[PDB]
Design a binder for this molecule. Structure first.
Ligand code: ONV
Ligand code: ONV
Lengths: 305, 292
């Protein structure tokens, strides 16, 4: 059963600490090339990654002891889950660990869109004083649409409520009565689009949420809507967003995530009304430490049944 | 009733200034010949002015304070200066909150990186606000608005105001402490005071010396409350991890050392630059006038 675990990426020593406390032997490697990793996994039931180490069908297939792969983070981009499940290898991740960091970044993106803070800093650093060029928006009394009312969507809701934003939204699993208890009014999507000043997505990436925002939904929005995607690349159709930015149907967007990372296509990043980060939603010392801890705790519970 | 308007004003304010007499002409970029013979005045931004002026009763600035109109020359004549001290409050508080989130996650620096074709995930390791301490100096309209918003993020809000009682500030969840007890506790410090002798260099080498190593500071209030030489020294040592500045001792600033620092976020004094603030000030000034 589960004994010895390799850590192949850099995450807080709180991870190692909890693993050995629960009986597991631990080793701690870093970077490691496609050939390198497998020579460690010779003797290992367990592999903990962050984002850098790719766990492809190759490593999975070529590693003849590996029973579980743990990601100290959200989703499994860097783990071939098709090939893992084929070989009976359990894949786990730490969904709770990043919630607050992702919600805080989303709120900062909304403030940034409202007041053009990234654009203003760039203008100051270019030696300009362009007070006129900037006219921002007060959030108080504006409507924020929240698509997805799990962990992150509800944390975004309660913070933006403090700004006196009205928070409306939709989730197919969360009842209107439960969303009401954290101040989010659920309506049909067709009724959400024309009410929103700001839209933010907090859904998993599924067929049903791939291009959730598209040409059809932008057609239904108020002119000048502002969009945030701090969830997963492709929930917002990037073509449809660029078309909405060019027409003015969309007055601005804030993107932490892209269909391709890093993105080869530069048109959205380069747009004047787009502010962007290189997938920083989970990039806080606090989230990184909580994910380290959460994966270790998940591992030890599997040894104790 | 001839009324000049020496500033980019909200078009609501003219559509207002025809309840009572108001013969208006909104001429920006001015200079002094403009106000020929006019008795009752409105302004936004932009003395020698009123001295060569004639029959003028009330001057009104759609904004807070009067830092673009000589109050003593106006007191040298009969002239009452009105302003709209609540019109800009929410917009200034909202910008301050956005500056706090930008300092925590370096969103302006991340955007500049991305627009250079970079994908810099390690440089941009940030801080969670939940569980951090925000020090708020000045607990008037703006300070209390910043406090209740940042409490929703799980920040502990402490502060100091010589005029606001500890009971008033406890009612909006701000614990007042002596300044000496505030500095060592703060992860973030934000200033919401008037610019007075007592508040000029309120943050200086002596106060940075008592702060936590890595404190972040915001000034969306008035240029000079943060001593700019002291703030650059603190950024240079790492005593200050970052600063967000909407305001500068000289606007526009000719000393570029702070604006050019990698850990400084800056705006060209945008705290009151929203449609809603500019509309609310245009009308709060009317009700002060049109209800003597
Ligand atoms: O007409 C329609 N076209 C397609 C469909 C609209 O698609 C949606 C599908 C959705 N799915 C979910 C969803 O799975 N929500 C749960 C929470 O209940 C959840 C689980 C995990 C996470 C996370 O990983 O952070 C987030 C949310 C929300 C959501 C919203 C919308 Cl608008 O309806
Ligand atoms: O030991 C000392 N070191 C320095 C010295 C004084 O420091 C202070 C002086 C202060 N003055 C005030 C102040 O005038 N506050 C009132 C609110 O009651 C106020 C009025 C208008 C506005 C506004 O225009 O938005 C804001 C606030 C706050 C404050 C804080 C501090 Cl730390 O004492």
């Amino acid at each position: 059963n589960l004994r010895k675990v390799l850590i192949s990426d850099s995450l807080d020593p709180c991870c190692r600490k909890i693993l050995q406390d629960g009986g597991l032997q631990v080793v701690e490697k870093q970077n490691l090339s496609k050939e390198e990793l497998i020579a460690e996994l010779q003797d290992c039931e367990g592999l903990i990654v962050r984002s850098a180490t790719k766990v492809t069908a190759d490593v999975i297939n070529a590693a003849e002891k590996l029973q579980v792969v743990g990601r100290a983070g959200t989703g499994v981009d860097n783990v071939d889950l098709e090939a893992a499940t084929r070989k009976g290898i359990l894949v786990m991740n730490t969904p709770n660990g990043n919630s607050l960091s992702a919600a805080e970044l989303t709120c900062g993106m909304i403030m940034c869109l409202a007041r053009q803070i990234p654009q203003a800093t760039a203008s100051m650093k270019d030696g300009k004083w362009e007070r006129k060029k900037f006219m921002g928006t007060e959030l108080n009394g504006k409507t924020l649409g929240i698509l997805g009312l799990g962990r992150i969507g509800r944390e975004v809701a309660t913070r933006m409520q403090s700004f006196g934003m009205k928070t409306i939204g939709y989730d197919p699993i969360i009842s209107p009565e439960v969303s009401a208890s954290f101040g989010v009014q659920q309506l049909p999507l067709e009724e959400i689009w024309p009410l929103c000043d700001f839209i933010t997505v907090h859904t998993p990436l599924l067929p049903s949420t791939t291009g959730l925002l598209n040409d059809n939904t932008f057609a239904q929005c108020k002119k000048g809507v502002r969009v945030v995607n701090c969830a997963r690349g492709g929930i917002v159709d990037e073509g449809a967003l660029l078309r909405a930015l060019q027409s003015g149907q969309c007055a601005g967007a804030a993107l932490d995530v892209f269909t391709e990372e890093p993105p080869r296509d530069r048109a959205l990043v380069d747009h004047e009304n787009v502010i962007s980060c290189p997938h920083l939603g989970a990039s806080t010392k606090e989230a990184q430490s909580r994910c380290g801890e959460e994966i270790a705790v998940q591992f030890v519970d599997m040894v104790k049944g």
